[model samples]
Target: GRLEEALELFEEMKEKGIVPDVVTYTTLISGLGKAGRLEEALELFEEMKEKGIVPNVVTYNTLISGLGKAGRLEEALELFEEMKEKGIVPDVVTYTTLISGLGKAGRLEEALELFEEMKEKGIVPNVVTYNTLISGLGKAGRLEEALELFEEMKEKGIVPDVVTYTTLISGLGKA
Candidate 1:
């Protein structure tokens, strides 16, 4: 109900000499993305750029996640590279989203390559990070490979904590 309000007000603000800033646009874009309106989110993302409202990492994450969920991994990955080219440093969440997307899409090579790239960038992954990657692998019939990662995480010393208790309980509950 309140969705169109953002777009209409966006125009009204511009018409009334009130340039939309980052905060407002970020919120609207986030709203559109989360609502599964990928195209609208992208439109606002581009418009935000056109108006010099620089999008931060959070903005990019929202669009990536939205695009990823829509199974538009190619575009999501493209934006991933594009953001870096614009001098925006990606964080764990970025790679996490992309990995989950590719893994879910059954593209093991693609997701693994991105994981390697993330590691090369010196971003340390955690237990949940491993969970997400392997979760995707398991989905893609890479269950064997996913097991390898579990052992590797243990070797690399990412001790499982309460997330382990929760994950085990939840997974077993489903089983």
Candidate 2:
């Protein structure tokens, strides 16, 4: 119902001749994504681009997240590269989303490469970032690397949450 209202508001805006900006489109895209309507989200995204509203980091981040959540990882990767080609510097959310997707997809090698790439680019990994990678590594039976990251996460002062401990314990049991 809320999403329908948002679309209705969007239509009303257009009817009033008030141009919807990037924020408007992104907000709607996010709504659609959260509701698991990826195709609609993608349509709105492309519609914005066609209207000359150059998407920003946040826009791409939302879209990539949507693609990742839907298990459309290749499309997410393509958008990631496309954004880079367009000079929209990928942010921490962008990297984390892709890493999470790749990790869940069992493409741990690619996930690790992105983790390394993010760090090399000086993008400090947040708690979520650490947790995602650690969870991935643990699930893959790479406990050695997972433990190493747990220690490294502590060294960086990113406090491990319950998810962190739980994932480690589960991984250990699986091992």
Candidate 3:
């Protein structure tokens, strides 16, 4: 009845000629990554690739976010590069996840660069992007820069949500 046990069972089924679909492997990869078994998850990803299973955006997004959460920023960056090379256009979720990861890793400049790149690529910055940048700069005591980002977002017609406002308020208080 163990969760890991279930994953193992599914893995066994795949080994025994039961072809695992994209969803199955995606779920397994996500579960393993969430459990902090990144190496295992990566191995499964490789196996999927070897089996001629092309990872969709959803799969890549899941792995990218897992690497980000694991603080494997470099790995995540490499994967992001690979995704680009393979012609996988990163969606809004992908950009947001990477931006948040870079922010958490104290790479606000890189995060901001990516944010600008997203705009250049015609991917409109959503509220999440602003919130992530605001929280990152605010936590780093860069209130001025954070406010500048808020203004930029306003110029872009992206309204700040409640979370953004809360971050701004807390940031101002801290400053």
**Strongest candidate by TM-score:** 2
Residue 19 of model 1 has an lDDT of 79
**TM-score, cand. 2:** 0.84
Considering only N, C-alpha and C atoms within 3 Å, which residue pairs clash in candidate 3?
Answer: none
Order the candidates by lDDT, highest first: 2, 3, 1
lDDT of 1 at 35: 78
lDDT of all predictions, in order shown? 0.81, 0.91, 0.87
Q: Which residue ranges in model 1 land beyond 4 Å of their true spot?
A: 135-148, 156-175
**Candidate 1 residue pairs in backbone clash:** none
Which candidate leads the pack in lDDT? Answer: 2
TM-score, every prediction: 0.80, 0.84, 0.80
**Candidates in order: C-alpha RMSD to true structure:** 4.4, 2.4, 2.8
lDDT of 1 by residue, 26-129 (tens): 89988888777889889988988997889999999999989888899989988999999999999988888898888778787877898889889998777767
How far is 83's C-alpha from truth in model 3 (Å)? 1.1
Off-target runs (Cα >4 Å) in candidate 3 are: 138-145, 161-175
Off by over 4 Å in 2: 12-17, 166-175
